[PDB]
Amino acid sequence: VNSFSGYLKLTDNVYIKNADIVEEAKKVKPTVVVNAANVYLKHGGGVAGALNKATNNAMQVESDDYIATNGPLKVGGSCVLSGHNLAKHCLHVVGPNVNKGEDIQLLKSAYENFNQHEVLLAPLLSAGIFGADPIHSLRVCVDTVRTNVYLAVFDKNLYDKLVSSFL
């Protein structure tokens, strides 16, 4: 049992809700919140900009030190950093950005990072400003992630479409 509330159950391990991931993280304080990161960990907009703003920029300060030490992530890759006031940990995952021409097959590699954590609160990778089809992202999530994932969908109209088209 866990404290995630109001989710629709899609499969044995995937759950979904129309929710602002910042507010959901603040309420639940999950072990892991996933960020929709880029390779430079520059948290400017979308989910990343919102999560970082909620940390009062502490996420960005930590991330800048990470990059100075380690260099950029890979597309499809991830790193674990602090969850600050949102979670124990933040799993920064880089899905491909269609608006940069990045190969959508890397979306499966990106979701594989979730399997290193038993329970996650997450957005749909590569959706939103990353330009991929959210229906496709949900399909890849369900077909790749085997651990328990609680998906927060920002847009209500999209949430209803994701539910109503789910196979």
PDB file of N, CA and C in Angstrom, residues 2 4-17 21 24 28 30 32-35 91 93 110-125 137-153 159 166:
ATOM      1  N   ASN A   2       0.409   2.264  -0.728  1.00  0.00           N
ATOM      2  CA  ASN A   2       1.062   3.561  -0.750  1.00  0.00           C
ATOM      3  C   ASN A   2      -0.015   4.639  -0.758  1.00  0.00           C
ATOM      4  N   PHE A   4      -0.510   7.207  -2.899  1.00  0.00           N
ATOM      5  CA  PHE A   4      -1.012   7.811  -4.126  1.00  0.00           C
ATOM      6  C   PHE A   4      -2.525   7.621  -4.194  1.00  0.00           C
ATOM      7  N   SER A   5      -3.243   8.709  -4.493  1.00  0.00           N
ATOM      8  CA  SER A   5      -4.699   8.751  -4.399  1.00  0.00           C
ATOM      9  C   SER A   5      -5.322   9.234  -5.706  1.00  0.00           C
ATOM     10  N   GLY A   6      -6.459   8.639  -6.079  1.00  0.00           N
ATOM     11  CA  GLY A   6      -7.211   9.120  -7.212  1.00  0.00           C
ATOM     12  C   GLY A   6      -6.683   8.720  -8.566  1.00  0.00           C
ATOM     13  N   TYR A   7      -5.763   7.758  -8.637  1.00  0.00           N
ATOM     14  CA  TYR A   7      -5.245   7.329  -9.929  1.00  0.00           C
ATOM     15  C   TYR A   7      -6.159   6.287 -10.574  1.00  0.00           C
ATOM     16  N   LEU A   8      -6.276   6.366 -11.897  1.00  0.00           N
ATOM     17  CA  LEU A   8      -6.851   5.286 -12.685  1.00  0.00           C
ATOM     18  C   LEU A   8      -5.766   4.219 -12.884  1.00  0.00           C
ATOM     19  N   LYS A   9      -6.144   2.955 -12.727  1.00  0.00           N
ATOM     20  CA  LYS A   9      -5.228   1.840 -12.932  1.00  0.00           C
ATOM     21  C   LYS A   9      -5.259   1.442 -14.401  1.00  0.00           C
ATOM     22  N   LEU A  10      -4.136   1.544 -15.113  1.00  0.00           N
ATOM     23  CA  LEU A  10      -4.098   1.133 -16.510  1.00  0.00           C
ATOM     24  C   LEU A  10      -3.701  -0.326 -16.670  1.00  0.00           C
ATOM     25  N   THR A  11      -2.695  -0.760 -15.904  1.00  0.00           N
ATOM     26  CA  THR A  11      -2.167  -2.106 -15.976  1.00  0.00           C
ATOM     27  C   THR A  11      -1.804  -2.560 -14.565  1.00  0.00           C
ATOM     28  N   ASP A  12      -1.168  -3.721 -14.470  1.00  0.00           N
ATOM     29  CA  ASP A  12      -0.707  -4.200 -13.180  1.00  0.00           C
ATOM     30  C   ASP A  12       0.180  -3.192 -12.461  1.00  0.00           C
ATOM     31  N   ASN A  13       0.970  -2.399 -13.204  1.00  0.00           N
ATOM     32  CA  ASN A  13       1.992  -1.547 -12.591  1.00  0.00           C
ATOM     33  C   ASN A  13       1.937  -0.078 -12.991  1.00  0.00           C
ATOM     34  N   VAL A  14       1.049   0.316 -13.898  1.00  0.00           N
ATOM     35  CA  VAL A  14       0.988   1.693 -14.382  1.00  0.00           C
ATOM     36  C   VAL A  14      -0.359   2.312 -13.998  1.00  0.00           C
ATOM     37  N   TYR A  15      -0.274   3.507 -13.399  1.00  0.00           N
ATOM     38  CA  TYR A  15      -1.394   4.281 -12.904  1.00  0.00           C
ATOM     39  C   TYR A  15      -1.309   5.685 -13.492  1.00  0.00           C
ATOM     40  N   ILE A  16      -2.458   6.372 -13.634  1.00  0.00           N
ATOM     41  CA  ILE A  16      -2.472   7.673 -14.296  1.00  0.00           C
ATOM     42  C   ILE A  16      -3.493   8.600 -13.653  1.00  0.00           C
ATOM     43  N   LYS A  17      -3.170   9.899 -13.618  1.00  0.00           N
ATOM     44  CA  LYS A  17      -4.043  10.908 -13.028  1.00  0.00           C
ATOM     45  C   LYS A  17      -3.818  12.242 -13.740  1.00  0.00           C
ATOM     46  N   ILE A  21       2.273  17.844 -11.409  1.00  0.00           N
ATOM     47  CA  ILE A  21       3.262  16.991 -10.755  1.00  0.00           C
ATOM     48  C   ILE A  21       3.914  17.681  -9.563  1.00  0.00           C
ATOM     49  N   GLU A  24       1.426  17.301  -6.709  1.00  0.00           N
ATOM     50  CA  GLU A  24       1.356  15.910  -6.314  1.00  0.00           C
ATOM     51  C   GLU A  24       2.606  15.481  -5.547  1.00  0.00           C
ATOM     52  N   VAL A  28       2.537  14.032  -1.638  1.00  0.00           N
ATOM     53  CA  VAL A  28       2.919  12.640  -1.408  1.00  0.00           C
ATOM     54  C   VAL A  28       4.328  12.498  -0.822  1.00  0.00           C
ATOM     55  N   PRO A  30       7.034  11.516  -2.534  1.00  0.00           N
ATOM     56  CA  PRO A  30       7.433  10.182  -2.963  1.00  0.00           C
ATOM     57  C   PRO A  30       8.926   9.972  -2.788  1.00  0.00           C
ATOM     58  N   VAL A  32      10.747   8.842  -5.171  1.00  0.00           N
ATOM     59  CA  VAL A  32      11.307   9.311  -6.434  1.00  0.00           C
ATOM     60  C   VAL A  32      10.276  10.116  -7.212  1.00  0.00           C
ATOM     61  N   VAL A  33      10.648  11.351  -7.590  1.00  0.00           N
ATOM     62  CA  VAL A  33       9.950  12.088  -8.629  1.00  0.00           C
ATOM     63  C   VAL A  33      10.854  12.137  -9.855  1.00  0.00           C
ATOM     64  N   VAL A  34      10.267  11.906 -11.027  1.00  0.00           N
ATOM     65  CA  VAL A  34      11.003  11.982 -12.282  1.00  0.00           C
ATOM     66  C   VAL A  34      10.878  13.390 -12.864  1.00  0.00           C
ATOM     67  N   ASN A  35      12.027  13.942 -13.281  1.00  0.00           N
ATOM     68  CA  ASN A  35      12.063  15.171 -14.051  1.00  0.00           C
ATOM     69  C   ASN A  35      12.238  14.859 -15.536  1.00  0.00           C
ATOM     70  N   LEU A  91      14.864  11.666 -10.089  1.00  0.00           N
ATOM     71  CA  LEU A  91      15.459  10.964 -11.217  1.00  0.00           C
ATOM     72  C   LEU A  91      15.297  11.857 -12.441  1.00  0.00           C
ATOM     73  N   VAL A  93      15.538  12.332 -16.128  1.00  0.00           N
ATOM     74  CA  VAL A  93      15.561  11.433 -17.281  1.00  0.00           C
ATOM     75  C   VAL A  93      15.451  12.256 -18.552  1.00  0.00           C
ATOM     76  N   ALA A 110      14.987   5.734 -22.500  1.00  0.00           N
ATOM     77  CA  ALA A 110      14.698   6.676 -21.427  1.00  0.00           C
ATOM     78  C   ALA A 110      13.812   6.033 -20.354  1.00  0.00           C
ATOM     79  N   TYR A 111      12.730   5.351 -20.770  1.00  0.00           N
ATOM     80  CA  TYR A 111      11.849   4.717 -19.793  1.00  0.00           C
ATOM     81  C   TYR A 111      12.528   3.574 -19.039  1.00  0.00           C
ATOM     82  N   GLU A 112      13.520   2.902 -19.645  1.00  0.00           N
ATOM     83  CA  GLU A 112      14.191   1.817 -18.938  1.00  0.00           C
ATOM     84  C   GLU A 112      14.817   2.302 -17.634  1.00  0.00           C
ATOM     85  N   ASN A 113      15.190   3.588 -17.540  1.00  0.00           N
ATOM     86  CA  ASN A 113      15.742   4.087 -16.284  1.00  0.00           C
ATOM     87  C   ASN A 113      14.768   3.904 -15.124  1.00  0.00           C
ATOM     88  N   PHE A 114      13.456   3.937 -15.405  1.00  0.00           N
ATOM     89  CA  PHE A 114      12.477   3.817 -14.334  1.00  0.00           C
ATOM     90  C   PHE A 114      12.572   2.464 -13.624  1.00  0.00           C
ATOM     91  N   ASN A 115      13.060   1.426 -14.331  1.00  0.00           N
ATOM     92  CA  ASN A 115      13.097   0.087 -13.755  1.00  0.00           C
ATOM     93  C   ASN A 115      14.110  -0.052 -12.627  1.00  0.00           C
ATOM     94  N   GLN A 116      14.970   0.951 -12.431  1.00  0.00           N
ATOM     95  CA  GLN A 116      15.907   0.965 -11.317  1.00  0.00           C
ATOM     96  C   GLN A 116      15.288   1.461 -10.015  1.00  0.00           C
ATOM     97  N   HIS A 117      13.985   1.752 -10.011  1.00  0.00           N
ATOM     98  CA  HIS A 117      13.296   2.297  -8.850  1.00  0.00           C
ATOM     99  C   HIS A 117      11.968   1.577  -8.694  1.00  0.00           C
ATOM    100  N   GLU A 118      11.665   1.133  -7.472  1.00  0.00           N
ATOM    101  CA  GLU A 118      10.470   0.308  -7.276  1.00  0.00           C
ATOM    102  C   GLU A 118       9.170   1.087  -7.464  1.00  0.00           C
ATOM    103  N   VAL A 119       9.165   2.379  -7.125  1.00  0.00           N
ATOM    104  CA  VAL A 119       7.974   3.229  -7.163  1.00  0.00           C
ATOM    105  C   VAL A 119       8.409   4.616  -7.630  1.00  0.00           C
ATOM    106  N   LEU A 120       7.701   5.186  -8.616  1.00  0.00           N
ATOM    107  CA  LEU A 120       8.009   6.529  -9.107  1.00  0.00           C
ATOM    108  C   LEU A 120       6.735   7.327  -9.331  1.00  0.00           C
ATOM    109  N   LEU A 121       6.849   8.642  -9.104  1.00  0.00           N
ATOM    110  CA  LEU A 121       5.913   9.638  -9.638  1.00  0.00           C
ATOM    111  C   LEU A 121       6.573  10.264 -10.867  1.00  0.00           C
ATOM    112  N   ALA A 122       5.876  10.304 -12.007  1.00  0.00           N
ATOM    113  CA  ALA A 122       6.549  10.696 -13.241  1.00  0.00           C
ATOM    114  C   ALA A 122       5.603  11.407 -14.193  1.00  0.00           C
ATOM    115  N   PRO A 123       6.158  12.237 -15.085  1.00  0.00           N
ATOM    116  CA  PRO A 123       5.439  12.721 -16.260  1.00  0.00           C
ATOM    117  C   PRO A 123       5.635  11.739 -17.418  1.00  0.00           C
ATOM    118  N   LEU A 124       4.842  11.936 -18.480  1.00  0.00           N
ATOM    119  CA  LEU A 124       5.075  11.226 -19.728  1.00  0.00           C
ATOM    120  C   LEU A 124       6.317  11.787 -20.419  1.00  0.00           C
ATOM    121  N   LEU A 125       7.325  10.944 -20.583  1.00  0.00           N
ATOM    122  CA  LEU A 125       8.575  11.388 -21.180  1.00  0.00           C
ATOM    123  C   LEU A 125       8.378  11.775 -22.638  1.00  0.00           C
ATOM    124  N   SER A 137       3.981   7.998 -26.048  1.00  0.00           N
ATOM    125  CA  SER A 137       4.773   7.927 -24.831  1.00  0.00           C
ATOM    126  C   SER A 137       4.140   7.004 -23.791  1.00  0.00           C
ATOM    127  N   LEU A 138       2.811   7.084 -23.626  1.00  0.00           N
ATOM    128  CA  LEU A 138       2.142   6.204 -22.676  1.00  0.00           C
ATOM    129  C   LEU A 138       2.300   4.737 -23.077  1.00  0.00           C
ATOM    130  N   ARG A 139       2.171   4.447 -24.371  1.00  0.00           N
ATOM    131  CA  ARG A 139       2.332   3.080 -24.852  1.00  0.00           C
ATOM    132  C   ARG A 139       3.737   2.558 -24.537  1.00  0.00           C
ATOM    133  N   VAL A 140       4.766   3.360 -24.846  1.00  0.00           N
ATOM    134  CA  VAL A 140       6.133   2.942 -24.549  1.00  0.00           C
ATOM    135  C   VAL A 140       6.319   2.745 -23.048  1.00  0.00           C
ATOM    136  N   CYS A 141       5.762   3.642 -22.230  1.00  0.00           N
ATOM    137  CA  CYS A 141       5.848   3.492 -20.786  1.00  0.00           C
ATOM    138  C   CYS A 141       5.285   2.126 -20.352  1.00  0.00           C
ATOM    139  N   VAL A 142       4.049   1.835 -20.761  1.00  0.00           N
ATOM    140  CA  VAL A 142       3.407   0.592 -20.334  1.00  0.00           C
ATOM    141  C   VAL A 142       4.194  -0.627 -20.795  1.00  0.00           C
ATOM    142  N   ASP A 143       4.793  -0.552 -21.983  1.00  0.00           N
ATOM    143  CA  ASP A 143       5.505  -1.684 -22.567  1.00  0.00           C
ATOM    144  C   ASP A 143       6.969  -1.777 -22.149  1.00  0.00           C
ATOM    145  N   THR A 144       7.452  -0.831 -21.341  1.00  0.00           N
ATOM    146  CA  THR A 144       8.856  -0.795 -20.929  1.00  0.00           C
ATOM    147  C   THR A 144       9.037  -0.838 -19.422  1.00  0.00           C
ATOM    148  N   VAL A 145       8.254  -0.049 -18.692  1.00  0.00           N
ATOM    149  CA  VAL A 145       8.396   0.049 -17.248  1.00  0.00           C
ATOM    150  C   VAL A 145       7.697  -1.134 -16.606  1.00  0.00           C
ATOM    151  N   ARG A 146       8.424  -1.819 -15.712  1.00  0.00           N
ATOM    152  CA  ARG A 146       7.908  -2.958 -14.965  1.00  0.00           C
ATOM    153  C   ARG A 146       7.716  -2.648 -13.490  1.00  0.00           C
ATOM    154  N   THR A 147       8.337  -1.585 -12.988  1.00  0.00           N
ATOM    155  CA  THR A 147       8.143  -1.121 -11.627  1.00  0.00           C
ATOM    156  C   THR A 147       6.879  -0.261 -11.565  1.00  0.00           C
ATOM    157  N   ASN A 148       6.508   0.169 -10.372  1.00  0.00           N
ATOM    158  CA  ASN A 148       5.224   0.833 -10.205  1.00  0.00           C
ATOM    159  C   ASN A 148       5.381   2.308 -10.492  1.00  0.00           C
ATOM    160  N   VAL A 149       4.654   2.772 -11.493  1.00  0.00           N
ATOM    161  CA  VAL A 149       4.758   4.150 -11.960  1.00  0.00           C
ATOM    162  C   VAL A 149       3.392   4.824 -11.895  1.00  0.00           C
ATOM    163  N   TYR A 150       3.401   6.010 -11.278  1.00  0.00           N
ATOM    164  CA  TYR A 150       2.247   6.875 -11.096  1.00  0.00           C
ATOM    165  C   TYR A 150       2.473   8.089 -11.997  1.00  0.00           C
ATOM    166  N   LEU A 151       1.707   8.164 -13.085  1.00  0.00           N
ATOM    167  CA  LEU A 151       1.868   9.192 -14.102  1.00  0.00           C
ATOM    168  C   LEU A 151       0.947  10.369 -13.825  1.00  0.00           C
ATOM    169  N   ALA A 152       1.545  11.567 -13.789  1.00  0.00           N
ATOM    170  CA  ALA A 152       0.811  12.817 -13.656  1.00  0.00           C
ATOM    171  C   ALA A 152       0.748  13.496 -15.026  1.00  0.00           C
ATOM    172  N   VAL A 153      -0.470  13.710 -15.520  1.00  0.00           N
ATOM    173  CA  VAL A 153      -0.698  14.345 -16.815  1.00  0.00           C
ATOM    174  C   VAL A 153      -1.178  15.747 -16.553  1.00  0.00           C
ATOM    175  N   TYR A 159      -5.319  14.152 -20.728  1.00  0.00           N
ATOM    176  CA  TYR A 159      -5.586  13.045 -19.812  1.00  0.00           C
ATOM    177  C   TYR A 159      -6.798  12.226 -20.277  1.00  0.00           C
ATOM    178  N   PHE A 166      -6.725   4.191 -24.578  1.00  0.00           N
ATOM    179  CA  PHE A 166      -5.754   3.238 -24.063  1.00  0.00           C
ATOM    180  C   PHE A 166      -6.155   1.809 -24.386  1.00  0.00           C
TER     181      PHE A 166
END
